Amino acid sequence: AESTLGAAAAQSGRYFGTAIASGRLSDSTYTSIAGREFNMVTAENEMKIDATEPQRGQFNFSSADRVYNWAVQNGKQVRGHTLAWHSQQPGWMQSLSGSALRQAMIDHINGVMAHYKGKIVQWDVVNEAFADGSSGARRDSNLQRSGNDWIEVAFRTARAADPSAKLCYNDYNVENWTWAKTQAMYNMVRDFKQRGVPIDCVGFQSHFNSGSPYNSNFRTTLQNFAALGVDVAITELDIQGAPASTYANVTNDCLAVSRCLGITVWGVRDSDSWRSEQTPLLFNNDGSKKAAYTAVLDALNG
Numbered sequence: 676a677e678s679t680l681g682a683a684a685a686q687s688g689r690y691f692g693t694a695i696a697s698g699r700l701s702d703s704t705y706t707s708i709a710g711r712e713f714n715m716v717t718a719e720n721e722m723k724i725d726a727t728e729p730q731r732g733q734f735n736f737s738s739a740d741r742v743y744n745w746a747v748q749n750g751k752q753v754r755g756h757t758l759a760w761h762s763q764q765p766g767w768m769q770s771l772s773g774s775a776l777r778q779a780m781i782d783h784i785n786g787v788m789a790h791y792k793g794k795i796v797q798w799d800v801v802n803e804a805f806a807d808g809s810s811g812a813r814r815d816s817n818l819q820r821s822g823n824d825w826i827e828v829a830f831r832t833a834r835a836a837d838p839s840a841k842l843c844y845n846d847y848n849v850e851n852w853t854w855a856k857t858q859a860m861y862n863m864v865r866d867f868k869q870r871g872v873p874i875d876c877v878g879f880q881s882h883f884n885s886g887s888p889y890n891s892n893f894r895t896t897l898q899n900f901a902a903l904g905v906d907v908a909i910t911e912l913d914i915q916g917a918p919a920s921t922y923a924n925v926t927n928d929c930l931a932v933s934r935c936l937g938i939t940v941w942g943v944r945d946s947d948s949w950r951s952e953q954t955p956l957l958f959n960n961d962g963s964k965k966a967a968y969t970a971v972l973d974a975l976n977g
């Protein structure tokens with residue numbers, strides 16, 4: 676048994692990660708708790724399209740490198756998030772459509788992956804391409820309006836740019852095996868594997884709440900995607916109210932699936948959360964451990 680989340684996960688060959696915000700790297704409580712507890716880092720915002728390419732052709736890795744360098748200095752690996760997404764696009768990309776947008780999407784993947792070549796274990800190459808609800812349709816965005824092949828082209832571009840990186844598709848509301856959105860993602864990955872589209876991993880954001888609740892069939896979802904020949908990862912876990920029971924269920928689901936690489940929670944303290952009002956993380960505002968922290972650590976330790 677180990678006394679910290681990352682070390683506990685590492686005993687079964689897994690990681691335990693968090694999202695890191697560069698502007699908070701001067702906060703001593705934040706940096707010391709995150710340093711101690713996690714062995715994997717995702718940049719919360721700094722590796723997104725707008726942050727990394729604020730003007731077309733003009734990259735800015737200053738804040739991204741602050742996160743990457745903090746991670747490596749503190750003994751963590753890094754998940755890159757995210758190369759192609761409808762949200763947080765810079766204005767210049769929002770205005771593009773069609774073939775011009777396709778070229779800009781490819782150029783953006785190539786430039787960011789070149790900067791980090793060989794240094795990023797997993798990339799969320801494409802994020803949030805499915806619509807919510809019963810349709811299983813693609814989300815409407817400039818990217819999707821450029822053609823159904825946007826996702827496959829992003830993945831082929833990424834495979835050529837950095838053959839060492841594991842290439843992930845990441846989404847939310849895709850954890851419950853019975854949901855239409857989950858099945859749409861399953862059918863896409865299955866099709867990609869049939870047609871030779873490079874995809875190595877699927878990320879399950881795991882933003883659980885009353886409208887999108889945890890279900891024990893998450894373990895079935897994880898198993899069934901692993902059986903397609905991809906790794907699986909829990910990428911942005913948070914749980915409304917932070918119940919200990921659900922936090923332990925999720926942890927045990929990952930521990931039960933050989934190709935589940937690890938778990939990232941989407942922040943450190945409740946006050947760091949994008950959904951702080953839902954008190955959905957493992958640490959209190961003062962940095963003390965919540966009941967859910969103990970439940971996770973115990974589950975990791977068997």
Ligand SMILES: O[C@@H]1[C@@H](O)[C@H](O[C@@H]2CCNC[C@H]2O)OC[C@H]1O
Nearest residue numbers: 719720756802847880911948949
């Ligand atoms: O700071 C906020 C981030 O936490 C938020 O991150 C997204 C959560 C949902 N899945 C994708 C993540 O990038 O993005 C908005 C930002 O304001």
